[PDB]
From a paper:
The structure shows three TNF monomers in the asymmetric unit (ASU) and clear electron density for one molecule of UCB-6876 bound at the centre of the TNF trimer. The compound was buried within the space between the three TNF monomers and did not make any contact with solvent. The asymmetry of the compound-bound TNF trimer results in minor distortion at two of the receptor-binding sites and a more significant change at the AC binding site (i.e., the receptor-binding site formed at the interface of the arbitrarily assigned A and C monomers in the crystal lattice). As indicated by the crystal structure, once bound it is completely buried between the TNF monomers, explaining the slow dissociation rate.
The compounds bind to a pocket in the centre of the TNF trimer formed by the movement of the TNF monomers, stabilising the distorted trimer, which leads to reduced signalling through TNFR1.
Residue numbers in the entry:
A (entry chain C): 11 to 69, 73 to 101, 112 to 157
B (entry chain B): 8 to 71, 73 to 101, 111 to 157
C (entry chain A): 7 to 71, 73 to 101, 112 to 157
Write the structure that this text describes.
């Protein structure tokens, strides 16, 4: 069962960087984390999921979070799962993502935001990215 | 290859005043028995499933009262009834707002059950990028 | 060929107006593979990574003379038997309005941990329909 659950570095400047060797971070049976992307070890069905958390103090920003599939043969980047929030006293806006996908060996997976300056990396729990082979 | 019943379907962007689910699209699935019939997902065998859906609504400013809803429903063949499993009602409110509603949970389903994912306001749906509006299940 | 993963999805008792009573004994609610509902709390039967998730829904009529809506998920560990916040959210809803609050995340949990999911304003809770208010864990 290839699985992987990576979390964001709280020790990172203006960047969304996925760690595996953090507290509570599986990454088993061959799921590489290279170039900040999960590399799919074998072809099949996978549950792919994510969450990020934004915060700010008062307020025109749009916050986007997006998971993509970089195909191993084709080679371009396609949105798999994506959402947008409009945050307009401190505020907190998470974005949830997840679903099931047929993936190929070698495909890469991105989990990215557009405004890492509003990212809340204060602990863990709710800024994560992962895949689970079914 | 997994024998697990799964499905991931996506919204038709040029379905007018409708929330229409498609599988014949890149990165969309019906596998291991799941069917797409009359805009619904039919389950092929009993057991625990994860069920999930996202819609993303978008308006330009606010002149009101506007309400947005997103509802995943179950028709159990045995009971011949339609029941909500997951439902959110939200009040947004000339700048643009967005409201993404992600509904997920785990459920015990039966062979032949039918699953719907519906909203009140198809006109407020946004399709700027792909992957913004989807509906899926994953047998455990 | 069933899954042996600790899972649970519990729903608000729509009969208990003015309160938040989690029910696994209701249509489309469940406990499996050792998860218990005790004293309004979910009990974790084995250690591991778990997705915890919950939604509550608030509705009110007009906006009075000022209202803060909170939703909190807490953990009571065997090793440390007092409530620790895991997840938390607050909203000001200010003529009906609807304000759903969603919380979830992935956490390492121990055997016999007790999880709680609470609101401060049960009087604004809306469960005229199922699927609006729920709480659950799924073992990863
Ligand atoms: C309740 C739920 C049910 C089904 C699905 C697909 C998700 C998506 N999801 C999310 C969404 O932020 N985080 C996750 C962590 C682990 C597994 C799935 C996850 C959540």
């Amino acid at each position: 069962k290839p699985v992987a659950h990576v979390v964001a570095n709280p020790q990172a400047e203006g960047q969304l960087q996925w760690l595996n060797r953090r507290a509570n971070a599986l990454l088993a049976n061959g799921v590489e984390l290279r170039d900040n992307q999960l590399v799919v070890p074998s072809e099949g069905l996978y549950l792919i999921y994510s969450q990020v958390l934004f915060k700010g103090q008062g307020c025109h920003v749009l916050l986007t979070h997006t998971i993509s599939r970089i195909a191993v043969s084709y080679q371009t980047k396609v949105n798999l799962l994506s959402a947008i929030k409009s945050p307009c006293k401190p505020w907190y806006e998470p974005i949830y993502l997840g679903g099931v996908f047929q993936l190929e060996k070698g495909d890469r997976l991105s989990a990215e935001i557009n405004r890492p300056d509003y990212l809340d990396f204060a602990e863990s729990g709710q800024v994560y990215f992962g895949i689970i082979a079914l």
